[PDB]
A paper describes a structure:
The spike (S) protein on the surface of SARS-CoV-2 exploits angiotensin-converting enzyme 2 (ACE2) as cellular receptor and mediates the fusion of the viral and the host cell membrane during infection. The activation of the S protein requires the receptor-binding domain (RBD) binding to the peptidase domain (PD) of ACE2 and the cleavage by host proteases into the N-terminal S1 subunit and the C-terminal S2 subunit. S1 consists of the N-terminal domain (NTD), the RBD, subdomain 1 and 2 (SD1 and SD2). Here we report the cryo-electron microscopy (cryo-EM) structures of trimeric extracellular domain of the S protein (hereinafter referred to as S) at multiple states and conformations, including the all RBD-locked, activated, S1/S2 trypsin-cleaved, PD of ACE2-bound, and the full-length ACE2-bound states.
We first solved the structure of the S protein alone that was purified in different batches and exhibited two conformations: the locked conformation and the active conformation, with overall resolutions of 2.7 Å and 3.3 Å, respectively. We did not observe the previously reported closed conformation, in which all RBD domains stay in “down” position but pack looser than that in the locked conformation. Transformation from the locked to the active state implies a tendency for S1 to become loose. The contact area between RBD and NTD of the S protein is reduced from the “down” RBD in locked conformation (locked-down) to the “down” RBD in active conformation (active-down) and to the “up” RBD in the active conformation (active-up). The S protein undergoes a clockwise twist from the locked conformation to the active conformation when looked from the S protein to the viral membrane, which loosens the NTD and SD1 domain by increasing the distance between the individual domain and the central axis.
Residue numbers in the entry:
A (entry chain A): 692 to 941, 944 to 1037
B (entry chain C): 544 to 618, 633 to 676, 690 to 741
C (entry chain C): 939 to 941, 944 to 1135
D (entry chain C): 298 to 395
E (entry chain B): 939 to 941, 944 to 987
The structure:
């Protein structure tokens, strides 16, 4: 193990003089990726099932704390509807589902790796499929039946452990196929209409002339595009190939951290059911048997207070995380309107 | 042996050492037990399971409701069976009729399915993303506008909320 | 005047509901024998009423704490909204914005502010093209073994004749040497036409 | 359920979460070991000679039903206090290392 | 050089005040007989 002083970067010097200028003579077409989180998992909690279980004595003792559970569930539902609103602001910008024609004559540019693949069950692109397999979720579907984990399969499958304690995960409103349809419409509009479909009705224009407009927008004359069209198309195709390559090779850490954080929060909730909180045991059935009502109520009160504050901590941290995801989704919506529907 | 509880007992594959009688999971609840007369191990599984949601068009319009059992797959652990049973990737929906059309979402059920109080009864459908469109793209065709419209739109933004103060002692 | 400002009414509703929830949470025992201090202080003597009063104090303190925490979170969200509104005031009202969909749908022309209870309303005036028409087009024009490109327009053709127009409004004009500029010969551009 | 969790008699259009699906127990079962004898209540409480407190006696008890109601006719205790358990629960339990 | 950076000093002030408030909150009984563990552990037996 070695320890060193970190370097800030390579040293450089500019040959500045009062009558010297440097002018470029060639260019490169670069393609870069930017990843942004847009939603997190929507969860719900049953207080009675988490705090008491099937205990009727505990559930009758809990009726002095019903306002707190209505409050918790109000907060969680606010988060849950905010997630769907986030996805809608990002992806549902345009409400016309444009298709790209079978005329794949785009001046030499090849958009085959980002356009839908009709050979799949879904209509996801090649790049979208490569992205889909680099993020491992925790819920492959949202129907886990009672008979499916009945026995010791519970408390060995974390999801049934969460479900037996009242912790539910709700499915998003837009399926993945609908989101793929939205991105497909955005791509088709942007490659057959330029930036006009974001300001009104889509007005077609040949792709090379649209690229010449975009070259004008950065301070380069159009003849620079028209005289170098094959070189530019080849550079673009090579850069797109480089992306797929890199991906299929080896990540989406910022999107996996969201899944990891939500799963860890739920599992921490489940393990915090082993705390005594100052009682004689952490099981309601060891207290309710070996102790009679009036003097078991003190222990059950300790347990109730502890578990309520556990739920409260969870909900608070979920609210804070949802605020951060909301900021990220707002940034993604701004980038969608200003980089995809226009030129910045 | 004095330990009380509620649940479902099933035959087990766990195998206890001779000095063991109960088995506990990570939440420290008893999930296995050795029967004191037959000396066989049993698993104890809880009895309640599965979320439930209720879809109403508002009780100021009707007291018809639909119920979504978010963990059932019918092709049951339901309160009633009625008619119009419709399976969804969000659960089994009971009380709403499935149609083949598609509209804008009214009440979001989930997984692409919405519900609405149409024709009265409750219907469930797949939400539509929008009208389909196609651009007449060719390699030498352009579309140029010949007129314009001046549009005025509103945008609302919250700027403040209520300023409050609390006296601890008085509360 | 017909028929809403839901985003501005939700703020009022949320604050009122939070205060009223605080008030109703004064009916909780929190594990004591009653939720009234006067039923405890009468029928119980100091040292053994102190346990009940301690339970009540702890419960009500945590109620206040929950309220303050959720108020802080909501205030952060309102702060973000107010920052966005200030940016929109400086960039859409005090200027003209080139950012797409920042000051309405269309090409932004101007904006006017109006005040509302706890908020602001922007009236965005934008320009939306309409009544489009199809034309044949070309990237360049070849005249004397030279390629001519438009200066600030696009080459269109009504079917037989060629004109140069502006991109956002059909206003055809005759192609001259003041509309175009020359660069190179007629062998490199792909869809060049003779005119 | 929703009317009552809302604390209102009117419900507005929408979808609301209710409690998880509950199932009620149908039967009650008890499973104790096969024990037939009664515990030596008459050679612990009715012994003829007790020990000195400095050399107190300790006796092991196992494999017997602890039906203490048989002590109601022949015994009257001036002090009886249990720690860690309730006296009203002693008839339902089962005891280890007595 | 004359005369400020209030927005940068408020951050330092807030963090310092939070830590010091943590330290002074060690003088609360929270409903116990004292706020010192050594006064409880001496004069009282474990249970
Ligand atoms: C532009 O001209 C300058 C002037 O010679 C070149 O820069 C110097 O390069 C040498 C060798 O790399 C360095 O040791 C000097 O420090 C540089 N700076 C000076 C002398 O001020 C530079 O290479 C030229 N740039 C191009 C693109 O040709
Ligand atoms: C501008 O740069 C490109 C490279 O990006 C040059 O084209 C390359 O030329 C070399 C040598 O002729 C070939 O081996 C490569 O295959 C070319 N690249 C591509 C993508 O075709 C081009 O010559 C440069 N232009 C000038 C004027 O220097
Ligand atoms: C551009 O559109 C406007 C409508 O926005 C047209 O003006 C309308 O013309 C019709 C028929 O002449 C009248 O009934 C309306 O009263 C006019 N509207 C207004 C607001 O005055 C206009 O003719 C169109 N121009 C072209 C060249 O088509
Ligand atoms: C394209 O536009 C030109 C206008 O320059 C049309 O040609 C003129 O049409 C007018 C009226 O029909 C005649 O008086 C002129 O003699 C024509 N020629 C010129 C040089 O002005 C032409 O008809 C249009 N073509 C189509 C298909 O609409
Ligand atoms: C407890 O008593 C039961 C009977 O009350 C015993 O059950 C017997 O078990 C044998 C197995 O070797 C069977 O052949 C008998 O038919 C059972 N009897 C009944 C009535 O079911 C049991 O064996 C006893 N416990 C022990 C440890 O021996
Ligand atoms: C302890 O000794 C007493 C007295 O010898 C026993 O009590 C008798 O119990 C029977 C049955 O309940 C009664 O009919 C008699 O009246 C009792 N004796 C007297 C003097 O009243 C008792 O059974 C002995 N305990 C044990 C465990 O054997
Ligand atoms: C290279 C790739 O990924 N896909 C195809 C390839 O399979 C096919 O041979 C080629 C010509 O049809 O076009 C491309
Ligand atoms: C009864 C039923 O729904 N069966 C389907 C089966 O046809 C389908 O192939 C499978 C796909 O995973 O899902 C299940
Ligand atoms: C031909 C083409 O490319 N696009 C459309 C075509 O799909 C449509 O049927 C027709 C009638 O509106 O208008 C044009
Ligand atoms: C008048 C004129 O320029 N005619 C030329 C012709 O000679 C040549 O064969 C053809 C192909 O390049 O292009 C044209
Ligand atoms: C586009 O590139 C792919 C390689 O991924 C190739 O299969 C396809 O033939 C290319 N399209 C054209 C028109 O050359
Ligand atoms: C619902 O009932 C109230 C009172 O009966 C009434 O004021 C209200 O207008 C009703 N809702 C509608 C949409 O009419
Ligand atoms: C219901 O069961 C069928 C086959 O048993 C399965 O294909 C389907 O996925 C299940 N329901 C859902 C929506 O998962
Ligand atoms: C609805 O869609 C189904 C899909 O198979 C089709 O069979 C049916 O004819 C359509 N009309 C109905 C059943 O209302
Ligand atoms: C443009 O021409 C195409 C090809 O027939 C047609 O689909 C479309 O209606 C035309 N657009 C206009 C605005 O005339
Ligand atoms: C446009 O495509 C046609 C095919 O219909 C082809 O003949 C022509 O050369 C192409 N022109 C350009 C500029 O791409
Ligand atoms: C354009 O003009 C040149 C010279 O007159 C001629 O060689 C060329 O073939 C022409 N192009 C077409 C498409 O007629």
């Amino acid at each position: 193990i070695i320890a060193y002083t970190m370097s800030l970067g390579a040293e450089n010097s500019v040959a500045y003089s009062n009558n010297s200028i440097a002018i470029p003579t060639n260019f490169t077409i670069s393609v870069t990726t930017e990843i942004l989180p847009v939603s997190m998992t929507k969860t719900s909690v049953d207080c009675t099932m988490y705090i008491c279980g099937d205990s009727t004595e505990c559930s009758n003792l809990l009726l002095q704390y019903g306002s707190f559970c209505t409050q918790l569930n109000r907060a969680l539902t606010g988060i849950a509807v905010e997630q769907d609103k986030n996805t809608q602001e990002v992806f549902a910008q345009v409400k016309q589902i444009y298709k790209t024609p079978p005329i794949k004559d785009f001046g030499g540019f090849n958009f085959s790796q980002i356009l839908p693949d009709p050979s799949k069950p879904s209509k996801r692109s090649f790049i979208e499929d490569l992205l889909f397999n680099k993020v491992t979720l925790a819920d492959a579907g949202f129907i886990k039946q009672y008979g499916d984990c009945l026995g010791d399969i519970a408390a060995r499958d974390l999801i049934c452990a969460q479900k037996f304690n009242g912790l539910t995960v709700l499915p998003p409103l837009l399926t993945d196929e609908m989101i793929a349809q939205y991105t497909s419409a955005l791509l088709a509009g942007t490659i057959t209409s330029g930036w006009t479909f974001g300001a009104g009705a889509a007005l077609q224009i040949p792709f090379a002339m649209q690229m010449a407009y975009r070259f004008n927008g950065i301070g380069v004359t159009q003849n620079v595009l028209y005289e170098n069209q094959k070189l530019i198309a080849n550079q673009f195709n090579s850069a797109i190939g480089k992306i797929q390559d890199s991906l299929s090779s080896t990540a989406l850490g910022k999107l996996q951290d969201v899944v990891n954080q939500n799963a860890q929060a739920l599992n921490t909730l489940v393990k915090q059911l082993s705390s005594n909180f100052g009682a004689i045991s952490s099981v309601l059935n060891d207290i309710l048997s070996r102790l009679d009502p009036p003097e078991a109520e003190v222990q059950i009160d300790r347990l109730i207070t502890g578990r309520l504050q556990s739920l409260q901590t969870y909900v608070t941290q979920q609210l804070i995380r949802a605020a951060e995801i909301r900021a990220s989704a707002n940034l993604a919506a701004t980038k969608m309107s200003e980089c995809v529907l226009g030129q910045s | 042996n004095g330990l009380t509880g509620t649940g479902v007992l099933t035959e087990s594959n766990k195998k206890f050492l001779p000095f063991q009688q109960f088995g506990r999971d990570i939440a420290d609840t008893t999930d296995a037990v050795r029967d004191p007369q037959t000396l066989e191990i049993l698993d104890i599984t809880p009895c309640s399971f599965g979320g439930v949601s209720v879809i109403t068009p508002g009780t100021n319009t009707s007291n018809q409701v639909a119920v979504l059992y978010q963990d059932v797959n019918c092709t049951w652990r339901v309160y009633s069976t009625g008619s119009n049973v419709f399976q969804t990737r969000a659960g089994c929906l009971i009380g709403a009729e499935h149609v083949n059309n598609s509209y804008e979402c009214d009440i979001p059920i989930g997984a692409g399915i919405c519900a609405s109080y149409q024709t009265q009864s409750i219907i469930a459908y797949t939400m539509s993303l929008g009208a389909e469109n196609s651009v007449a793209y060719s390699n030498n065709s352009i579309a140029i506008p010949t007129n314009f419209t001046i549009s005025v739109t509103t945008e609302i933004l919250p700027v403040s909320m209520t300023k409050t103060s609390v006296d601890c002692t008085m509360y | 005047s017909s028929t809403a400002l839901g985003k501005l009414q939700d703020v009022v509703n949320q604050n009122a509901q939070a205060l009223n929830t605080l008030v109703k949470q004064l009916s909780s025992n929190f594990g004591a024998i009653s939720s009234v201090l006067n039923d405890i202080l009468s029928r119980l003597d100091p040292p053994e009423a102190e346990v009940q009063i301690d339970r009540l104090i702890t419960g009500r303190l945590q109620s206040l704490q929950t309220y303050v925490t959720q108020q802080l979170i909501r205030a952060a969200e309102i702060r973000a909204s107010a920052n966005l509104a200030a940016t929109k005031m400086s960039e859409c009202v005090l200027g003209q914005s080139k950012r797409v969909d920042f000051c309405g749908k269309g090409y932004h022309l101007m904006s006017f502010p109006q005040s509302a209870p706890h908020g602001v309303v922007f009236l965005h005036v934008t320009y939306v093209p309409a009544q489009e028409k199809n034309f044949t087009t070309a990237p360049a024009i070849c005249h004397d073994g030279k390629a001519h490109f438009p200066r600030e327009g696009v080459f269109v053709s009504n079917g037989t004749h060629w004109f140069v127009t502006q991109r956002n409004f059909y206003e055809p004009q005759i192609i001259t040497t003041d509309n175009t500029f020359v660069s190179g010969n007629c062998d490199v551009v792909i869809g060049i036409v003779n005119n | 359920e929703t009317k009552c969790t809302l604390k209102s008699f009117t419900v507005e259009k929408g979808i609301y979460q209710t409690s998880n699906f509950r199932v009620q127990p149908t039967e009650s079962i008890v499973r104790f070991p096969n024990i037939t004898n009664l515990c030596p209540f008459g050679e612990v409480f009715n012994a003829t000679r007790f020990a000195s407190v400095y050399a107190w006696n300790r006796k092991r008890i196992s494999n017997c039903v602890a039906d203490y109601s048989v002590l109601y006719n022949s015994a009257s205790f001036s002090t009886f206090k249990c720690y860690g358990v309730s006296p009203t629960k002693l008839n339902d339990l089962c005891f280890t290392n007595v």
